[PDB]
Amino acid sequence: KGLTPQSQDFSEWYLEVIQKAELADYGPVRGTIVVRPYGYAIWENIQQVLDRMFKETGHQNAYFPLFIPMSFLFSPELAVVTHAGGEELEEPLAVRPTSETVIGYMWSKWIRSWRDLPQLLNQWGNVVRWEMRTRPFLRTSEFLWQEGHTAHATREEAEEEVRRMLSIYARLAREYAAIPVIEGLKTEKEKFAGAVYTTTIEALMKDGKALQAGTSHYLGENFARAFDIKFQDRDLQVKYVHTTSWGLSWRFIGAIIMTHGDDRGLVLPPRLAPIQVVIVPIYKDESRERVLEAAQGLRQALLAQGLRVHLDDRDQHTPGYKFHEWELKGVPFRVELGPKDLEGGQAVLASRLGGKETLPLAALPEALPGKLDAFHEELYRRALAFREDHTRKVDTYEAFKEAVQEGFALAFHCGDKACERLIQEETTATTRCVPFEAEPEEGFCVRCGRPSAYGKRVVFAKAY
Amino acid sequence: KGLTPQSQDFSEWYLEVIQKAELADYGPVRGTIVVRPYGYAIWENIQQVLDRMFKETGHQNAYFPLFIPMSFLFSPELAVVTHAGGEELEEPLAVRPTSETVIGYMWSKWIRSWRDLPQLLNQWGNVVRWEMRTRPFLRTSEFLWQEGHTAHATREEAEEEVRRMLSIYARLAREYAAIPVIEGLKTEKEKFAGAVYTTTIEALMKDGKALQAGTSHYLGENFARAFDIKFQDRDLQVKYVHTTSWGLSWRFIGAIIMTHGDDRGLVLPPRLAPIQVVIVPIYKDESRERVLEAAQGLRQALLAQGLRVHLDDRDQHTPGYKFHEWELKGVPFRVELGPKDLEGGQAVLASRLGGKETLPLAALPEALPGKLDAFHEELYRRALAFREDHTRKVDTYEAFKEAVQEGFALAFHCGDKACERLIQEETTATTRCVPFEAEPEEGFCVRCGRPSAYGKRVVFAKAY
Ligand SMILES: [Zn+2]
Ligand SMILES: [Zn+2]
Numbered sequence: 001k002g003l004t005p006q007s008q009d010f011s012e013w014y015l016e017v018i019q020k021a022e023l024a025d026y027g028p029v030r031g032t033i034v035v036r037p038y039g040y041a042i043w044e045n046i047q048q049v050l051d052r053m054f055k056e057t058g059h060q061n062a063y064f065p066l067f068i069p070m071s072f073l074f075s076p077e078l079a080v081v082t083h084a085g086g087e088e089l090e091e092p093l094a095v096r097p098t099s100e101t102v103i104g105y106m107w108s109k110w111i112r113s114w115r116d117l118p119q120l121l122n123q124w125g126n127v128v129r130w131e132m133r134t135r136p137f138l139r140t141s142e143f144l145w146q147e148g149h150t151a152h153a154t155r156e157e158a159e160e161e162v163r164r165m166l167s168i169y170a171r172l173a174r175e176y177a178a179i180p181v182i183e184g185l186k187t188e189k190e191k192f193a194g195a196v197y198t199t200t201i202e203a204l205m206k207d208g209k210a211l212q213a214g215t216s217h218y219l220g221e222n223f224a225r226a227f228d229i230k231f232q233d234r235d236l237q238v239k240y241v242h243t244t245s246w247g248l249s250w251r252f253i254g255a256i257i258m259t260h261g262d263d264r265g266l267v268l269p270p271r272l273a274p275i276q277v278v279i280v281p282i283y284k285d286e287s288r289e290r291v292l293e294a295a296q297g298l299r300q301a302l303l304a305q306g307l308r309v310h311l312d313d314r315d316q317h318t319p320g321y322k323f324h325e326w327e328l329k330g331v332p333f334r335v336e337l338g339p340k341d342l343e344g345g346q347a348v349l350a351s352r353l354g355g356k357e358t359l360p361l362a363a364l365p366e367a368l369p370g371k372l373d374a375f376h377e378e379l380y381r382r383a384l385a386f387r388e389d390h391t392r393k394v395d396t397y398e399a400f401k402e403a404v405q406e407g408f409a410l411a412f413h414c415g416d417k418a419c420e421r422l423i424q425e426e427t428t429a430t431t432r433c434v435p436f437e438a439e440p441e442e443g444f445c446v447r448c449g450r451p452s453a454y455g456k457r458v459v460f461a462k463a464y
Numbered sequence: 465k466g467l468t469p470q471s472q473d474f475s476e477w478y479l480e481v482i483q484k485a486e487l488a489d490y491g492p493v494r495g496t497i498v499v500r501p502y503g504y505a506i507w508e509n510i511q512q513v514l515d516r517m518f519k520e521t522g523h524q525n526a527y528f529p530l531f532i533p534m535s536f537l538f539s540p541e542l543a544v545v546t547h548a549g550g551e552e553l554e555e556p557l558a559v560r561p562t563s564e565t566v567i568g569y570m571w572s573k574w575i576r577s578w579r580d581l582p583q584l585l586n587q588w589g590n591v592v593r594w595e596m597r598t599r600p601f602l603r604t605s606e607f608l609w610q611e612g613h614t615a616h617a618t619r620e621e622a623e624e625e626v627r628r629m630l631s632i633y634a635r636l637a638r639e640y641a642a643i644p645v646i647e648g649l650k651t652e653k654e655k656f657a658g659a660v661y662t663t664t665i666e667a668l669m670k671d672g673k674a675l676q677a678g679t680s681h682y683l684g685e686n687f688a689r690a691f692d693i694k695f696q697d698r699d700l701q702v703k704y705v706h707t708t709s710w711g712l713s714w715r716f717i718g719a720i721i722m723t724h725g726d727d728r729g730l731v732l733p734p735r736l737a738p739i740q741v742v743i744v745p746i747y748k749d750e751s752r753e754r755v756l757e758a759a760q761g762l763r764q765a766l767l768a769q770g771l772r773v774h775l776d777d778r779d780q781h782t783p784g785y786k787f788h789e790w791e792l793k794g795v796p797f798r799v800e801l802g803p804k805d806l807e808g809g810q811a812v813l814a815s816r817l818g819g820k821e822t823l824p825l826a827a828l829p830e831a832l833p834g835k836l837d838a839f840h841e842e843l844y845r846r847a848l849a850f851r852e853d854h855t856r857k858v859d860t861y862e863a864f865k866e867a868v869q870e871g872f873a874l875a876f877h878c879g880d881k882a883c884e885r886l887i888q889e890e891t892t893a894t895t896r897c898v899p900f901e902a903e904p905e906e907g908f909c910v911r912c913g914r915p916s917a918y919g920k921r922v923v924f925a926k927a928y
Contacts, residue, residue: 025570025574027528027529027566027570028532028533028536028566028569029529029531029532029533029557032529032530032531033529034526034527034528034529034566034570035526035527035528036526037524037525037526037585040524040525040526040527041524041525043527044525060501060504060505061501061504061505061508062498062499062500062501062504063498063499063504063507063608064491064498065491065493065496065497065498065606066496066559066590066592066606067493067496067543067605067606068492068493069492069493072492074547074550075550076549076550076551077549078547078548079531079545079547079548079557080545080546080547080548081543081544081545081559082544082545082546082547083538083542083543083544083546083556084540084542084543084544084594084605085540085594085596086538086539086540087540092547093493093543095530095545095559102491102492102498105491105492106489106491106498110489115780121501125589125590126530126589126590128530130548130549130550132549141531141548142529142530142531144527316578316579316580316581317579
């Protein structure tokens with residue numbers, strides 16, 4: 001049964017492609033998924049890219065415990081261990097929803113003077129925050145992610161870190177996933193309760209809904225006061241540190257799926273694709289030797305170019321099967337190398353985006369790199385256009401209701417939480433972010449008509 | 465004050481070095497630890513090396529859920545979740561002690577014919593096996609590791625996979641950690657219960673006790689039958705798959721500490737050491753510019769050589785302090801770069817293995833790589849010498865009791881589980897493995913006297 005078209009039922013389309021492209025599958029325990037190889041490889045590329053960016057910026061990876069003192073934290077989001085070692089634990093243990101509490105404790109003892117700062121920490125791994133609504137890569141009790149935490153001697157240095165990390169996520173989205181995003185502040189209502197403020201990158205999925213792709217919080221001294229994290233400054237005065245926190249999960253994979261995916265399956269951005277180019281040799285007993293030899297030569301030639309190429313010479317499947325599979329899995333480029341074309345020293349180069357062409361094998365190594373970039377460029381261009389066509393300035397609550405039905409709605413807002421929640425209660429739409437950079441404007445709240453706040457229009461939308 | 469000497473109290477020396485070298489610290493939960501950046505970096509290196517080796521052999525990474533249905537398995541080793549989402553669960557969940565059961569379940573559905581074979585999976589991550597003791601990188605309820613799982617169409621292909629992965633573990637040990645190991649089979653008593661047989665690599669620590677560094681099991685059809693994992697072969701006949709299993713945890717880090725460490729602290733193998741060379745610039749105000757410029761020049765030159773070099777320009781610590789820290793942390797080489805020697809175009813190269821030599825700065829970059837290799841070779845050589853000195857062939861149960869007090873005891877054994885458990889109850893020593901490459905010998909059980917089995921002497925020792 002072919003893939004349900006996006007125009008017919010996006011939600012179902014989403015669930016089916018994750019299944020058909022073999023990204024994930026449902027685990028025995030309700031609410032849990034099994035991330036398959038192909039899907040995991042996408043997460044690995046995302047991790048490698050972020051890790052380099054984190055490292056170049058001084059952060060270091062560490063590993064805080066999976067089990068957290070219940071005393072240090074009953075709460076619906078927690079999965080609690082009550083039995084272990086063949087007995088009831090006098091002290092039940094919570095599975096970490098995040099490592100912040102343990103981090104705060106360790107920082108309390110590790111940080112003593114300005115010499116101990118900054119503290120630039122990151123951790124890759126799983127966390128658990130119980131969820132009733134199951135949905136692959138979007139909402140699951142357990143998921144993988146990366147959460148960073150930093151401590152600084154001054155406020156300035158911390159706020160700079162906050163933006164530094166958000167820009168890293170924005171770069172990941174733009175330069176690597178070709179996903180357009182808006183950088184800005186969450187409103188008081190939408191921010192993390194414990195942060196002075198929360199910055200975010202908001203993306204628009206092909207179904208017109210918004211998805212938060214990354215977050216970076218400025219915690220001020222809130223976290224430091226809570227865990228008694230202080231240091232002796234150069235002026236001998238004892239002060240609390242200024243901290244930040246930022247995370248990005250495999251929800252990003254969902255963002256990639258719903259941003260570039262089409263009715264034929266996945267379309268992965270070249271710079272995060274586990275396989276940028278797949279070679280599918282076609283032959284018969286007679287032409288086996290010649291074809292595979294040429295297929296392998298091309299494989300090496302592409303590897304030498306630093307490209308992630310895969311030679312699918314599997315005997316357990318037919319060419320028709322392979323082509324269909326690699327299409328579903330969104331491989332940017334496919335190379336059909338058959339006996340006939342091979343005589344002419346050529347092969348067929350197909351683009352997941354559409355179109356094919358016969359070219360000489362020798363020219364392929366030198367051309368693919370530029371083509372991959374072009375492929376990336378096209379994905380971004382198309383995504384930008386979609387966003388443009390699905391973003392609308394609104395001055396009336398009537399036009400607002402129409403706008404949040406198709407995508408982004410740029411509207412004035414009074415800045416009142418109550419007015420903001422009312423809009424959500426009536427339209428289900430939420431404020432996604434007050435962008436850092438946008439046309440400066442002054443007006444009146446799209447809902448209550450009172451003077452507009454923020455000095456610009458706020459981005460609203462129905463969100464994931 | 466120094467570290468408790470190894471000969472004074474090995475165990476206390478162990479805990480102290482981990483603490484002092486900042487490999488790990490203690491978390492709020494009695495039993496949970498925190499792996500610091502320097503300690504984590506070692507694991508990251510082990511992971512990269514193993515990952516490359518698994519990848520080149522066709523394996524692929526995946527991610528199975530943390531929680532497993534209790535029905536798939538309260539055994540004291542298990543940590544059980546009975547409360548989640550603010551409510552008490554009807555079906556108690558187990559935190560994975562291994563993903564084997566969920567993998568078996570998924571394979572049951574994914575595997576249908578020969579086209580789905582072979583299955584070559586691996587997973588990096590945490591698992592939990594309750595431990596009352598708490599020794600970082602040796603015995604902890606929660607730990608990180610890698611566990612591989614494969615499904616094959618034939619017994620021959622499965623058994624080959626088993627030895628392929630053991631050899632990979634042996635290569636990591638020998639070629640990367642400079643840790644000598646003995647490859648062999650576990651006895652029936654020591655093998656994994658659900659396995660036809662268990663292979664392993666056994667290392668000897670500096671305290672004369674043996675340590676299982678890694679294992680690879682041939683599960684035959686036991687696993688397939690238990691989880692109903694079968695396939696339609698080319699001959700249209702439905703058959704059970706043959707599976708293998710293999711794992712290696714950061715316990716491997718403890719092996720490194722106890723194999724090469726000394727009274728001065730850690731001694732990291734060059735090929736796994738986060739920092740292979742550390743540059744310590746010594747200077748004054750009038751020579752600060754010249755030195756640092758020379759240091760940075762050497763830094764770059766070494767990086768250009770592909771070496772993991774670190775420049776410790778921290779001006780808040782005396783050169784002595786630095787020398788001590790990098791020695792404690794086991795950095796292979798330390799370059800002392802000062803005013804006087806620099807004028808001569810030279811610097812002092814200090815080896816963690818002992819000794820110094822003044823060499824021309826210009827020749828260093830080209831020489832270090834080869835020196836690191838010799839350093840590695842020396843580490844291995846010493847460990848081999850140690851093993852030879854702590855290994856002894858015994859023909860009497862008297863000589864056996866002496867040998868297993870110092871290290872390895874090469875004795876004949878009848879092969880009876882009963883006799884084997886007796887030797888353990890009487891000496892605490894266990895069989896480590898029946899070595900693959902062991903001189904063929906026939907004799908009589910070192911304890912009961914009955915005719916010897918295995919056609920060779922069995923390795924015995926007190927073990928971790
Ligand atoms: Zn209003
Ligand atoms: Zn016996």
